[PDB]
Design an enzyme around this catalytic site. Structure first.
Site, PDB file in Angstrom:
ATOM      1  N   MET A  25      39.445  -0.242  -6.674  1.00  0.00           N
ATOM      2  CA  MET A  25      40.611  -0.479  -7.553  1.00  0.00           C
ATOM      3  C   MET A  25      41.781   0.396  -7.118  1.00  0.00           C
ATOM      4  SD  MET A  25      41.014  -0.541 -11.752  1.00  0.00           S
ATOM      5  CE  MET A  25      40.271  -2.187 -11.769  1.00  0.00           C
ATOM      6  N   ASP A 136      39.712  -3.408  13.027  1.00  0.00           N
ATOM      7  CA  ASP A 136      40.074  -4.380  12.017  1.00  0.00           C
ATOM      8  C   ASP A 136      41.579  -4.486  11.787  1.00  0.00           C
ATOM      9  OD1 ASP A 136      39.450  -6.487  10.354  1.00  0.00           O
ATOM     10  OD2 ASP A 136      39.121  -5.184   8.628  1.00  0.00           O
TER      11      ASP A 136
END
EC number: 2.7.11.24
Length: 336
Positions: A25, A136
């Protein structure tokens, strides 16, 4: 213990007035010591060893790196004991947007594309100089502030480079996010060489030119179809570099395909941009341009300055032990 969307977001007293950003979050939050709003991500990895591995990498790497085009860690919030530590909060500079969000909504001028690519490669020069592979790179891992300063984030998937142990078999490996994954990943590579990252940067550059991913594979197996669809059939020489027979014979089984010219795919692009694009999106990873060469390419001549493109000072070399290591690695942020 303050809340956000039915979850504890407990950062106090230093960080207040929280606003939800998205998905662990993430929230913005006012930093009461340095009087600026910050980003804070709550990380809850301790019940999945893959999450512990990635969290420990992110932390160890970003604490050791210091570079203008790599996001820093400003602070790490956690309980005073291993027993009480159920989440870790990582505090970073707040960034207005990211290249994923920007490409969905904004045309980039050629000057913006040039500047973004410069900053990406400048940061990558440092990462690669530390013998680290990001693995990535993609638009959502490139953060941007209101003045278009660009910072690379998310080193959870990173590895130390290992070119002698890069070889593997056909259709095994999943390195990077699909659309940004180099052709060799599907053929014969574990993604342990620096050329893996250059491919992803080439994909990013292509996407900046047209606001669409260049190789939008619909699933894992589609990705090679898209790549070969544009680059065309690999040459005899490039095939000869693939000694593995399942991979080589798969490529030999395909009907001949010709190369789609970059100037037809990208009619509005700067010709120097397409020349550099061509070199980053080279099929054979041995022939693919390296980060220092890419920086020196004519496209980036307005920015290129190797004395202002710094390198790292030195190269980098079960769940319960990893929780201890994450506790150890975050101790410097505790009071006193």
């Amino acid at each position: 213990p303050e809340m956000v969307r039915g979850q504890v977001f407990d950062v106090g007293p230093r960080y207040t007035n929280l606003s939800y950003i998205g998905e662990g979050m993430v929230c913005s939050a006012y930093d009461n010591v340095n009087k600026v709003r910050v980003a804070i991500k709550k990380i809850s990895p301790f019940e999945h060893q893959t999450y512990c591995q990635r969290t420990l990498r992110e932390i160890k790497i970003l604490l050791r790196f210091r570079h203008e085009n790599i996001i820093g860690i400003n602070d790490i919030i956690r309980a005073p004991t291993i027993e009480q530590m159920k989440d870790v909060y990582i505090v970073q500079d707040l960034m207005e947007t990211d290249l994923y969000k920007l490409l969905k909504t904004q045309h980039l001028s050629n000057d913006h594309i040039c500047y973004f690519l410069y900053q990406i490669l400048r940061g990558l020069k440092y990462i690669h100089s530390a013998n680290v592979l990001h693995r990535d790179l993609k638009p959502s891992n490139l953060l941007l502030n209101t003045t278009c300063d660009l910072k690379i984030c998310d080193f959870g998937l990173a590895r130390v480079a290992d070119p002698d142990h890069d070889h593997t078999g056909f259709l095994t490996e999943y390195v990077a996010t699909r659309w940004y994954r180099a052709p060799e990943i599907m053929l014969n590579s574990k993604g342990y060489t620096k050329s893996i990252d250059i491919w992803s940067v080439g994909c990013i550059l292509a996407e900046m030119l047209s606001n669409r991913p260049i190789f939008p594979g619909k699933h894992y197996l589609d990705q090679l179809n898209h790549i070969l669809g544009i680059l065309g059939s690999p040459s005899q020489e490039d095939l000869n570099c693939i000694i593995n027979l399942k991979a080589r014979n798969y490529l030999l089984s395909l009907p001949h395909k010709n190369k789609v010219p970059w100037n037809r795919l990208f009619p509005n692009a700067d010709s120097k941009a397409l020349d550099l694009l061509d070199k980053m999106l080279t099929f054979n990873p041995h022939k693919r341009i390296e980060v220092e060469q890419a920086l020196a390419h004519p496209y980036l001549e307005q920015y290129y300055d190797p004395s202002d493109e710094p390198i790292a000072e030195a190269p980098f070399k079960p769940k319960e032990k990893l929780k201890e290591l994450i506790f150890e690695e975050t101790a410097r942020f505790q009071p006193g």
